[PDB]
Design a protein around this ligand. Sequence first.
Ligand SMILES: *C/C=C(C)/C=C/C1=C(C)CCCC1(C)C
Length: 137
Amino acid sequence: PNFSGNWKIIRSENFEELLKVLGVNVMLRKIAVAAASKPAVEIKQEGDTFYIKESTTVRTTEINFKVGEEFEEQTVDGRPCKSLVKWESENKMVCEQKLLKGEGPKTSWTLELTNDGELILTMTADDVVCTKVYVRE
Ligand SMILES: *C/C=C(C)/C=C/C1=C(C)CCCC1(C)C
């Protein structure tokens, strides 16, 4: 399993609802959902080390981490968390996040590489689940 690639989105489910429970206000939400129409996701994996960049017309976000080692990452709405990724299986990693300040929805994300070359991202905020599917460009 090598998650490396330039990935383009082919389906998305429930992203706007995710942002709502994350408390993003309606104005900022409409801006976000519209932009998320044509993102680019770039991943590079070397062993257990990862870099992930996701870009829309309004914003680019970049993160790097190593599976199994704590790191810091913001929630999708910009709140700081301590995160830790583990392999759930050979083709699926799961990130658990703990907010550093205040209280808020419990957040997580997972990334899975299917045998037919799709990348599936799931993002959770409390009970809301968002799913995005990408293929290589
Ligand atoms: C619309 C989807 C996102 C904003 C997801 C961003 C994202 C990735 C594409 C890779 C995993 C981390 C995370 C920042 C959630």
